Subunit: 349 residues, 4 copies
C-alpha cells in the first residue's frame, strides 16, 4: 500500500559524496578541543574507539588507546575468563578506561557479570542487527541488573532503531550497517545505509534524548572522521585504520620483504570459527603501521585541521553547526591528488 | 506531440543503485521462510529458477534445482523429441517439478504438445521481445488449448507489456530486457530498462491481477537477489550464477591449470547456430564452481540474512514492506570491501 | 543579471546516460524500414553518412557508402580540382549520391562552383563553430546563387543556432560540438553539449520548419545510432566506426602482426598541415575492419533490432514516439557484458 | 536547530561536471581580447598567474610570466632579504609586474615593508584558511599602513569569506580550498568546495563590490581555465601546469631517460621544513615541459578557442554571459578522446 509507493524514495550519502564547507574561524588547529563526553562516567580526551575485533583490540591495544585519550573495546572471541582477565589487565595499568564486547547469547549475563567484577567501564552489546527483539530484550535485562553500567548497543542505521535501543536502556548507540572495509553484508544480504546518512538520521533521533552516537565503520582517511563527527556522532570507531599497528593482536608477517598484519571481518570464516550463516566479512592483510601513537597523531591532527577550517573550537560546535556540500564523482577526483606522480608517501595519505 | 516532450522524463534504477534498509526484526535468518507460490500447481521451496539456456539447464541441472526446492527450465536448442525426453527424465526422477522453453515459431504448438505429454509443469514462452503481437497471439493460442497449463511468458520490462501478457493468458510474467551478464542488447540495439525499475514497474501491474513476476537477469551476488525480490518479484532466474556448476551442460575445460565452463548468450553466434539478425549476446567462460548445492546454499544463505535484516519472516513481507535507499557510485564503493588486500576468497564473494 | 543566475541551470545527456524503452511491436527487425528523406532530391535507403574527414571519405568510400544506401562526404583537404574529380568519379559510378565538404573561406564559392559542375548532390559547409556570422553569411550567399542545391550546414549544438542556419537557408543542419572520438574541443576550449541533448534540442527547433538534422559524432556502438535517431535525428554521421574499413583513404599499416589504419581529427596537427589555432583533435590508429559492407551490415542490423524493440516500423515512428529511460553509471555497467570472461569477440561488440 | 536541518542541502560543481554552451559568435579566436584589469595599478594582458610555491615561482618564472602578459607570485619560503631581492630582480628587468607571497606571522609587516621598498606590485596574503580572524586582522593592518598597495587575500571558498576579506580591505580575493593537484586538504581535513561552485559563489559576492576574484587551483587543461573565467573569475592561478617549465625553480632531474622536475604542495613535509600540523599536500614529480612560452601559448590558444565558441569578444562578456550545461560521468567520457588509440601526444593534451 503506502509502503509499496515509498520503496525507492529515500536517498543516502557516504563520506566520498560530501565535503565540509569552510567557515569563519578564530581558532588554530592546535587550540581546538577534541574532548568528548559519552556519559557522566565515560569521558574521552580524543573521540576515537578501536573496534571490538579479534584482529584489532585486546589489552595492549586498549591500554595504548586509553593513554592516547581514547577507548579500546576488548573483543568477545575468547572465553569469559580470558576477557575478564584482559579488562583487569587494562584497569591495573593505571585505572585506564576500557570497554568489552558481548554478544546476544544465553551466557551474555554470565559474561557481563565477570566483566563488571573486573571493573569494565562500558559493555558493548555487539550484534550484526541491533534493531532486533533479541537485542532490545538483552539491553533491558542488562540495564535492569546494572542501573549505572555504560551500555553501548548496536549496530543500527535508522532513527527508529536508535529510538528502540535508547528506550530499552542503551546510553550510547553504535551506528553502521555495511560500511566496514572488511564488510560484505551489502553484497551478500543486499542491506545497508550509506554511512553519513546513517549517522545523521540516528543522531537526529538520539539528540532528542541527549544520547550520543558512535560512527562505526567505513572511515578510510582522517577527513572521513571529521565528516562523521560533523554528521552528528560524538565519536568514531575504527577497525582498518588501527589494524596493523604494533599494539593490535596477531603477529607481524613478512612477505616479499614487507611487513603485514592480518585484518578480518568478525563475520569472516576464520573469525566465526574462533541453514548455518553465510559469511558477511572477508579476511585480508594490511601493511604494518608501527606504533599506535603515530597513527593516532595523524588522525587527531587531521581532525584539528578540519575543525580549524570549520571554525569549530570544540566537537559540540562541529556537530551542531558544520555544513556539508554535496559533490559528484568528478568532485571526488578533484578532492584527491591528481595529475601528479607522487614520489613520497605522506604520513597521512 | 506529448510523446516528444516525455522522451527523457523516466528514470531507472539497477541493483548497484540501492541498498535495502534494515528494519525491526524478531526473526533469525535460519527461521525465515523462503517458500513461494507461483500458482496453485507451481509452488517452490526456494525462489530460484535456472535459465533456459544451452549452457545452463538440461535434465541434470533441472533435477538438481528441483531437489534444492527450485526449478529448472530445459532450453529449446534441441529437437522436440530431445526436449520431451529431458522433461520426462526429470519427472521420472521422483516427480520433481520441471519447466521447458518454447519459442514463437510455427512448430511451437507441436513442441508444446509433446512437452505436455511428457508431464512438463510449466512452459516458458521465451522471446527477446515479449511485448509483441506474435507473443500475445501465441499465449492466447496455448492458453485456449491448455486451460490449466502454467504459462510463463516474457521477456518484458514495462507495466503495459505485463498487462498485455496477463490479458493474453500468461499466469507468470518474466521480467528483464538487457540486464544479462552475457547480454549485448543494450549495446547493439540501445534498448533496455534498469532491472530493479523493470521489476518494480512490472510487479506494480501484475499485483493488480494477483500475478507473480520472475526477475530474470543481471544478478551477480546473493544480495542482488534479495533486492530483486524486495522490488516485487516472487522469484529470480539466474544464468551466470549457475553456469559452471557440475550439473550444467557442457564439459569442464582446463586452461593453465584452472577449470572453466563455457557460458554464452542464447543470442550469441554459437547458440543461434545450434537482413539476418545480428547477435545480441556474447560467448565466454566462467570458473568451474563445483556442485550446484554449494552455490545454492550460499545464495539462499544470503537471502536469509537479508530477510533477517529486513525483519521479513517470509517473502510476501519482503515484497510488500521492504524499503530501499538510493546511493551514488561512492555509496557502491563503500558497499564492497575496500582498502584491504583480500587474501582468501570467500564462498560468497 | 538574468544570465548570471542561469549559468548552471541546464543539464545534458549523452548516449551512455539513457536506454530506449521497449514498446508494443508487431514488426520484426527484418520488416522495418530504415529509409529516410533529407530533401526532395536527397533520399537515403539507410540513415548513415560517412564523415568528411581525410582519413574517412574520398571517392572509394563514397561509392561504397552510396551502394549500401547511405552517403559519403568527400573531405576538403585537397585542391578544388581534386575534390571535383572525386565527386565526378562517384557520379560516373552509376549516378550514385555524393556530398562534399567546403570550409568558410574566400575561395568557398569557387570550390562550390566546381563541385556543382561535377554534379555533387549536397554541399556540407563544415565548420568548427556553425553558430557564427561567417557561416550564416556563407550559407545565405550559397543559397542565393544555388536555390535548388542541398546545403548541409554545421556544426551546431543549440536550438538558436539551428534556427539561425535554417533562416540563412540551410536545408539540413548538422549537430555535434565536442562528441567526436578524436575530438579534444571539450578539453582544450571547455566547450560542448552532451550529444543526445544537442540532437534533441536542435531537432525540437528544426521540426518546426520541417528540417532534418544529422547527429554527427560520438557514436561508438550500433545502439548509440538508434539512440541518436530516437532523439530526433533523421540520420547519423560516423567517423571512427568507418575509419579502418578497406574503402577509407590511407594505407593499412602493420604493427606487431596486426593491421591498423590512421584515424585523426581534422583539427589535429597533421590534418591542419595538409596567435595561430591550437589543435582540437588527436591523431590515432584504429584496427583494420575489412570491407565497409560488413560494418554497415552490423550497424543496420543493430538499428533493425532497436526499431523492432521500440515497435518502430519506420524511422519517423522512432523519432516521434520512442521513449528513453535515464540511468546512472551503475545502469551503464549492467548494460554491457559483466562478470564473464569473453572468449570470442562478436561482430558487433 | 536551523543549522542541523541545512547540513546536507548545498551542492557543488567542479570543472569536469560541466561544459560551456556554444553561442552566436562573430569573433574568431585570434581576434578576441584576453586582457584583464585587476585594479587601477594591476592590469594583465593574459589572465594567468603562476602560484606562489617554492617549486613554481621565483624571479625567472615571474620575469617570464610578466613578459607573456601575466603575473608571477614570488613564494615566501625564503628570507625577507632574499624575497625582496627577487622582487627587485624582476623590477629591474624592464619594470615588469611582480607579486609576492606573505604569511600571517608576527614578522609579516617587516616582510611587507621590504617588498614595498623593492617596488612589489601586489602582496598576496597567502593562508590555508583565509576566512579567519588572523587573516582579516592582518589585511586591515596592511591596508591601513599601505592605502594604495594591491592586496590579494585568500584562500577562501564562500561568499561570506569573500565579503569579510573585501571589508577588511583586500582588493583582490583568491578562491580555492582543496582543489589543488598536489592538495590533500580534502582527504586529511575533510574540507573543501568544488572549485567551479567556489568561484561562482565568491564572484557573486565580489561583483557587488566591483572586486575581482582569482580562481586558484584544480586547473588541469586549458578548457578548465575557460570554465573558471566563465564561472566569474577575472584570472586564474596555476601550479601544476607551470611546474616543470624551464623557468620554474629547481633542477631538471633525469630518471630512466626522461626529464622531470619536483612539484610539491606548500603544505607537504618538505616544503614545511624549508600538536604540530599534519601535512596537507604531497611531493611529486612532473614531466619537464620546456620553456614557459610554449605552455602559455597552448593555454591562451585554448582560451581563445573557448571564447570564440562562446562568442566572447572579451573576458567581461565571458564572465557576464557564458552559460554552462551540467553533465554526468558519461558526459565526461564523451568529452575526452575515446575508443581510439592515440599515437602522438598533442601539445595541448
Ligand atoms: C555472518 C555473521 O556476521 C557477523 C559476525 C559478527 O561477529 N559481526 C558482524 C557484524 C556485522 C555484520 C556481520 C557480522 C553473522 C551475521 N549475522 C546476522 C545477520 C542478520 C541477522 Cl537478522 C542476524 C544475524 N549474525 N552473525
Ligand atoms: C539475436 C537474437 O538474440 C536472442 C536470442 C535468444 O534466443 N534469446 C534472446 C534473449 C534476449 C535478447 C536476445 C536474444 C534475437 C534477437 N531477436 C529479436 C530482437 C528484437 C525483436 Cl523486436 C525481435 C527479435 N530475436 N532473436
Ligand atoms: C583547431 C581547428 O579544429 C578543427 C578543424 C577542423 O577542420 N574541423 C574541426 C571540427 C570540430 C572542431 C575543431 C575542428 C579549428 C578550430 N577552429 C575554431 C574554433 C573556434 C571558433 Cl569560434 C572558430 C574556429 N577553427 N579550426
Ligand atoms: C599543513 C599546512 O598546509 C599548508 C601550508 C601552506 O603553506 N599552504 C597551504 C595551502 C593550502 C592548504 C594547506 C597549506 C598548514 C595547514 N594549515 C592550516 C589549516 C587549517 C587552519 Cl584553520 C589553519 C591552518 N596551516 N598550515
Ligand atoms: O565481518 C563483518 N561484517 C560486517 N561488518 C563487520 C564485520 N566485522 C566487523 N564489522 C564492522 O566493521 C567495523 C570496522 O570497519 P572499518 O573501520 O572500516 O575497517 C567494525 O567496528 C564493525 O562494526
Ligand atoms: O544472448 C542473449 N542476449 C540477451 N539476453 C540473454 C541472452 N541469452 C540469455 N539472455 C537473458 O539473460 C539471462 C541470464 O542473465 P544472467 O543471470 O545475468 O547471466 C537469461 O535468463 C535471459 O533472460
Ligand atoms: O579534430 C576535430 N576536433 C573536433 N571534432 C572533430 C575533429 N575532426 C572531426 N570532428 C568531428 O567528429 C566527427 C567524427 O566523430 P566520431 O564518429 O565519434 O569519430 C566528425 O564527423 C566531425 O563532426
Ligand atoms: O600543500 C598544499 N595543500 C593544499 N593546497 C595547496 C598546497 N600547496 C599549494 N596549494 C594550492 O594549490 C594551488 C596549485 O594548484 P594546481 O594548479 O592544481 O597544481 C596553489 O596555488 C595553492 O592555492
Amino acid at each position: 500500500n503506502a509502503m509499496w509507493e515509498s520503496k525507492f524514495v529515500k536517498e543516502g550519502l557516504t563520506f566520498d559524496d560530501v565535503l565540509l564547507v569552510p567557515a569563519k574561524s578564530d581558532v588554530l588547529p592546535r587550540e581546538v578541543s577534541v574532548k568528548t563526553v559519552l556519559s557522566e562516567s565515560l569521558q574521552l580526551n580524543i573521540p576515537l574507539i578501536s573496534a571490538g575485533m579479534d584482529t584489532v583490540t585486546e589489552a595492549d591495544m586498549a591500554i595504548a588507546m586509553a593513554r592516547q585519550g581514547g577507548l579500546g573495546i576488548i573483543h568477545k572471541n575468547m572465553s569469559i575468563e580470558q576477557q575478564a582477565e584482559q579488562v583487569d589487565k587494562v584497569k591495573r595499568s593505571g585505572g585506564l578506561l576500557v570497554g568489552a564486547a558481548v554478544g546476544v547469547t544465553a551466557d551474555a549475563m554470565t559474561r557481563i557479570d565477570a566483566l563488571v567484577k573486573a571493573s569494565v567501564d562500558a559493555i558493548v552489546l555487539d550484534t550484526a542487527h541491533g534493531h532486533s527483539q533479541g537485542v532490545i530484550d538483552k539491553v533491558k535485562e542488562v540495564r535492569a541488573k546494572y542501573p549505572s553500567l555504560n551500555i553501548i548497543a548496536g549496530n543500527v542505521a535508522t532513527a527508529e532503531a536508535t529510538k528502540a535501543l535508547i528506550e530499552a536502556g542503551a546510553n550510547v548507540v553504535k551506528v553502521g550497517i555495511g560500511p566496514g572495509s572488511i564488510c560484505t553484508t551489502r553484497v551478500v544480504a543486499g542491506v545497508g545505509v550509506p554511512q553519513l546518512t546513517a549517522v545523521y538520521d540516528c543522531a537526529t533521533e538520539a539528540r532528542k534524548h541527549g544520547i550520543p552516537v558512535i560512527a562505526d565503520g567505513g572511515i578510510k582517511y582522517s577527513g572521513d572522521m571529521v565528516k562523521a563527527l560533523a554528521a552528528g556522532a560524538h565519536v568514531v570507531m575504527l577497525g582498518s585504520m588501527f589494524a596493523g599497528v604494533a599494539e593490535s593482536p596477531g603477529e607481524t608477517e613478512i612477505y616479499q620483504g614487507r611487513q603485514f598484519k592480518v585484518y578480518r571481518g568478525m563475520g569472516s570464516v576464520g573469525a566465526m570459527e574462533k541453514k548455518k550463516l553465510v559469511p558477511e566479512g572477508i579476511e585480508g592483510r594490511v601493511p604494518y603501521k608501527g606504533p599506535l601513537a603515530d597513527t593516532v597523531h595523524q588522525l587527531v591532527g587531521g581532525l584539528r585541521a578540519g575543525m580549524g577550517y570549520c571554525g569549530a573550537q570544540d566537537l559540540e560546535f562541529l556537530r551542531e553547526n558544520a555544513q556539508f556540500i554535496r559533490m559528484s564523482g568528478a568532485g571526488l577526483l578533484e578532492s584527491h591528488p591528481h595529475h601528479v606522480q607522487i614520489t613520497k608517501e605522506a604520513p597521512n595519505y
